[PDB]
Design a protein around this nucleic acid. Structure first.
Ligand SMILES: [Mg+2]
Ligand SMILES: [Mg+2]
Ligand SMILES: [Mg+2]
Ligand SMILES: [Mg+2]
Ligand SMILES: [Mg+2]
Ligand SMILES: [Mg+2]
Ligand SMILES: [Mg+2]
Ligand SMILES: [Mg+2]
Ligand SMILES: [Mg+2]
Ligand SMILES: [Mg+2]
Ligand SMILES: [Mg+2]
Ligand SMILES: [Mg+2]
Ligand SMILES: [Mg+2]
Ligand SMILES: [Mg+2]
Ligand SMILES: [Mg+2]
Ligand SMILES: [Mg+2]
Ligand SMILES: [Mg+2]
Ligand SMILES: [Mg+2]
Lengths: 133, 48, 136, 48, 53
RNA sequence: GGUGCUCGGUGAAACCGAGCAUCCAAUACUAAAGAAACUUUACUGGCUUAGUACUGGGACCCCAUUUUUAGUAUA
RNA sequence: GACACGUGGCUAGGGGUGAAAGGCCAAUCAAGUUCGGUAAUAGCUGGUUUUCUGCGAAAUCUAUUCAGGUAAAGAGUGUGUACUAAGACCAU
RNA sequence: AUACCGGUAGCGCAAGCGAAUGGUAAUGGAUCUAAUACAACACAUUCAGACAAUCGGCGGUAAGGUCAAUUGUCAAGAGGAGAACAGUCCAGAGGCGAGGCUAAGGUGCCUAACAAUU
RNA sequence: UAACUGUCCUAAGGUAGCGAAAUUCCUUGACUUGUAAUUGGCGUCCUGCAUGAAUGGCGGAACGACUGUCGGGCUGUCUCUAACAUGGAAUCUGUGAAUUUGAAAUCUUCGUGCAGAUGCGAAGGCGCUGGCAAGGGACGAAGAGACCCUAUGCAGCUUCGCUGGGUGCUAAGAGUUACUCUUAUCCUCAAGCUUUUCUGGGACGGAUGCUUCCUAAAUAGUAACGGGAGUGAUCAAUGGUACUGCUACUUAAAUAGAAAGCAGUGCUUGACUGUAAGAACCACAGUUCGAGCAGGGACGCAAGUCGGCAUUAAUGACCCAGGGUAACAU
RNA sequence: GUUACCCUGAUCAACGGACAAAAGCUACGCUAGGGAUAACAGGCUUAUCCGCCUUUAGAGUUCCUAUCGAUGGGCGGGUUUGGCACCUCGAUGUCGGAUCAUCGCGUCCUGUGGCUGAAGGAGGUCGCAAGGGUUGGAUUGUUCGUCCAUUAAAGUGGUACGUGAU
């Protein structure tokens, strides 16, 4: 069991898309800019930026809104929405290469089987073989 | 968190900062073209 | 001196050691001559009624007795032959937490000499030390 | 180098793959898909 | 449970090729034959699915 | 030139025409809530023969500074 | 005398015999002795034989016909790789 | 050039305030690092723990009782003190020396050391 | 007192003749005798924890190395022991073992200590070594099993434990044409296998998933047959989307909620197909969140939401068996 | 038929789910271990027990203290019943008396002092004192208990509730 429910990335921590910022029961913290909210009110980042926790007026009282503020060197390399997506994609690709360099090939990253291509749909990448008409 | 296993969070934090470093340098250099602690001589010892 | 409630609930801690020396429940609020404790001791209901009758014997009908402690804390005591374990025992007696600075018997204008006389019989029947406090 | 009075101390009584009673290697699905032929063929590159 | 009469039942496509959805249903509170428009991947168009066991 | 209470007007918006309270352009009391400051002490970190062996941090409440109100008065 | 004794004979082991006691069947019988399968099996107990040097734990946690056993994780050693660090402290 | 997280101790009649230690991230260390970090590289062992201090449940605010949290020691640790002493205090033993300075503890005699302050 | 009547589940509620008895808890059963004094007998009485014609009920002659009690006689069993006899023992000569054994040069008391010290500490005592005696200590010696617990433990026995035609009868066919063969199966005989675990011993009782609250000490986490509530679902709408009125509820508790509350409406099935970077977590297996991309759709003018329900429970691996479809094969 | 995909089916509730199925007995028992698990008792504790008080309301023909202690609060012992399982299962006499002992005093007597509601007697306490004395047997397996009748009295305990290499 254990059910660990707390805040994972504090304010001023650099975040990347998909990183869970806080896990809670009920909306103690409310989602803000560049932030998603899950089924169990998990707050997850949808942009590269530092987490900012600010307090705003609320319907019941003192709402705390968790947000991700994009970097000041981003929004300078970036219509704007397409440019931000391209800048974020390069940062995400660079993060993977740095992480693979730091884990020096000691973990099983990719399948590399002696088999025919791992089952591929028209889209490809299916770990499920399906017979074709 | 009860798992007695080393967290990968320090590696993830280091990867994120190292990933954004080329963008930071390029944009800071672009602003510097388009537009902290004082240190003393290292003495061997302070007793004559 | 009994828990005047509907549930036979259970407790975890039986202690009250914490000091309230500053203006914090230290002045008299209902009477003018008070009797207070000086050290923390959890005390049972039978002692509270025994001291109450023992000091009431030295009190006239024109003297109100403002008691300040009510026995509402269940204490669970296991029977003689029960082996250690198998859950918590039945509630045997009711007790109160006493703090070092709490006034527990405060009196009206019954004379201070008689109030000091009643304190001696109260302190004789009580496990922890007692002290004299007045409105002043 | 064996320690004190276990079952490892008695020698040759316990297989290496026994894990206590949870048969974890027997919890994964069995696939009977035979791979296609041409994996029995010799594969030669145009580069060679 | 045994008191709960709700069971799982199958929704067979009208179109053809036997693609189906398995969804639960209360028999007492729904004596309809359950019919909904769901996506059929064999034809990649939405068709109807009636209830058969 | 400001916010609202709503009559309508379109574009779904928000503002427009009204007409009252102050925002400005008041003083003088009272009952609420907040803000920052602070004496003392609980409470604590280290040390500890369990604190006439010590030492760092430090509340709450009251008093006093002040803000958002509301109510009662003035010519 | 429902007697005792002597000499040969018969009933043999999952069997004999028993006025019936888990009695007797060659001094260890609710399953004789000997040999073979057999170097049975024992998560249990006992034991393990020359020296020096370097490093050095754990008795937590999860699962288990399982809690005196085992396996995975944590903590050890050697080897490799790699940072003035995926490190330790202190300050803001 | 610091920022977020927590709702306990205490307080309140309640609603609610609310520490100290703490966690996490950034920045700075000519502070430490005869080592550390990682390893789908290999070989293990362990998976019966005990007690002391500070804070607790169940016990009798009993038990070298049993079960939590933090720290230490023993386990796997000799030496000095505690008369003797697993777990207390000081202190971590490569060896030899009829050299010196100290810790805990002492300074009437056993028993080393001031009628020091006396 | 309950003789005759009134009742309830029920095969039936135990006769003349029995009973504190081989067997009756109260117990020193009240009652007589027995002794000066009786809990163990004798003969009555009733209040049968847990008696009773085939588990044979009611007593009798004779019998018993059977059991419990009373009188006579008898005497060292005793009050209370003494002397003597024979044979060991003790002395000498001759022959001549064994149990045991870490090494011993083995004091007392108090304290300490794997918790009862010859060996440690403090104090004290002690010329040395023996024979003949007594046995308090050396947790004397003698058996690695008195009792309890455990084992992937054995063994034998029992049965409305399980499975078998092995075995005996039986059933149905068949042959020579009573006997024999084949197949099946009740009831017997002989076997073979099972017959968990946690537990302040074991037995008994209780429990063995998942969720929440207190313990739990202000990140997370944190135990005990520790303490209080839930749950093994419901719902074709209580799902999705777009709206309309009103405002102290929504629920297992906590966190939250101007709607995630209470009443409604209009359309719909995203209660989808194929995927998913990155994280929470975490031994592993699994578990949890997930922006985005492609397909085809739903609602909405749009903004945009929708991969079931505000969340945390209602989620049992693999194997095996069955169904639809697709490809290959015969 | 083979293989994939889409799916379904256990209160597999011993819920990481033994190999098909599936109950007991052993005072006839056997083996291997455990003082890792209990009993005979040594160690720790003192809830229950036993002494000492204190408060002493009251009783005592009056009057708290001749004498008793109601209610609360404590201190001491581990000889009661309990709790833990630290010590011995390479098995160790206890739950009795027969003989023989040693020690403590919380003294039953003998030796004695105070208060006495003290006629001396005969008593009740209370203070000192452990030298040596505490006998019969009828009944119960009873160390428990009476009641026969005598004494000055027919003491209570530590003694692995002393004592089977007597
Ligand atoms: Mg044989
Ligand atoms: Mg350790
Ligand atoms: Mg284990
Ligand atoms: Mg509080
Ligand atoms: Mg520790
Ligand atoms: Mg150490
Ligand atoms: Mg040492
Ligand atoms: Mg020493
Ligand atoms: Mg002779
Ligand atoms: Mg001794
Ligand atoms: Mg001699
Ligand atoms: Mg001799
Ligand atoms: Mg077993
Ligand atoms: Mg289920
Ligand atoms: Mg199939
Ligand atoms: Mg199981
Ligand atoms: Mg089976
Ligand atoms: Mg004992």
């Amino acid at each position: 069991x254990x059910x660990x429910x707390x805040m994972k990335l504090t304010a001023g921590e650099l975040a990347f898309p998909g990183m869970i910022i806080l896990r809670q029961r009920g909306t103690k913290f409310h989602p803000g800019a560049n932030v998603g909210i899950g089924r169990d009110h998990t707050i997850f980042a949808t942009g590269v930026g530092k987490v900012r926790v600010d307090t705003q007026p609320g319907p019941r009282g003192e709402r705390r809104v968790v947000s991700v503020e994009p970097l000041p060197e981003a929004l300078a390399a970036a219509d704007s929405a397409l440019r931000l997506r391209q800048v974020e994609a390069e940062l995400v690709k660079r993060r993977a290469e740095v992480k693979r360099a730091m884990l020096q090939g000691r973990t099983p990253l990719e399948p590399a089987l002696y088999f025919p291509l791992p089952r591929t749909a028209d889209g490809q990448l299916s770990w499920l073989e399906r017979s074709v008409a | 968190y009860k798992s007695n296993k080393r967290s990968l969070k320090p590696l993830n934090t280091a990867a994120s900062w190292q990933a954004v470093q080329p963008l930071l340098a390029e944009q800071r250099q672009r602003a510097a073209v388009e537009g902290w602690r004082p240190r003393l001589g290292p003495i061997v010892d302070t007793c004559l | 001196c009994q828990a005047g409630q509907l549930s036979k609930q259970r407790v975890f801690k039986r202690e009250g050691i914490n000091d309230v020396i500053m203006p914090n429940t230290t002045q008299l609020r209902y009477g003018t001559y008070g009797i207070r404790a000086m050290a923390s001791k959890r005390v049972g209901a039978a002692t509270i009624e025994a001291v109450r009758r023992t000091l009431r014997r030295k009190i006239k009908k024109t003297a109100r007795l403002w008691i300040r402690l009510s026995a509402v804390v269940p204490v669970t005591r296991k029977p003689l032959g029960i082996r250690m374990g198998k859950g918590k025992g039945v509630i045997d007696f009711y007790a109160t937490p006493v703090r070092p600075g709490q006034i527990i018997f405060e009196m009206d204008r019954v004379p201070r000499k008689v109030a000091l006389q009643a304190l001696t019989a109260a302190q004789h029947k009580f496990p922890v030390k007692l002290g004299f406090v007045e409105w002043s | 180098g064996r320690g004190m009075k276990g079952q490892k101390s008695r020698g040759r009584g316990l297989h290496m793959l026994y894990d206590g009673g949870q048969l974890g290697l027997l919890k994964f699905p069995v696939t009977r898909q035979r791979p296609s032929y041409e994996v029995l063929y010799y594969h030669l590159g145009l580069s060679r | 449970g045994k008191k709960g009469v709700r069971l799982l039942v199958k929704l067979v496509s009208t179109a053809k090729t036997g693609f189906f959805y398995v969804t639960e249903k209360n028999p007492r509170n729904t004596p309809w034959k359950l019919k909904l428009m769901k996506f059929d991947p064999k034809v990649n168009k939405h068709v109807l699915f009636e209830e058969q066991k």
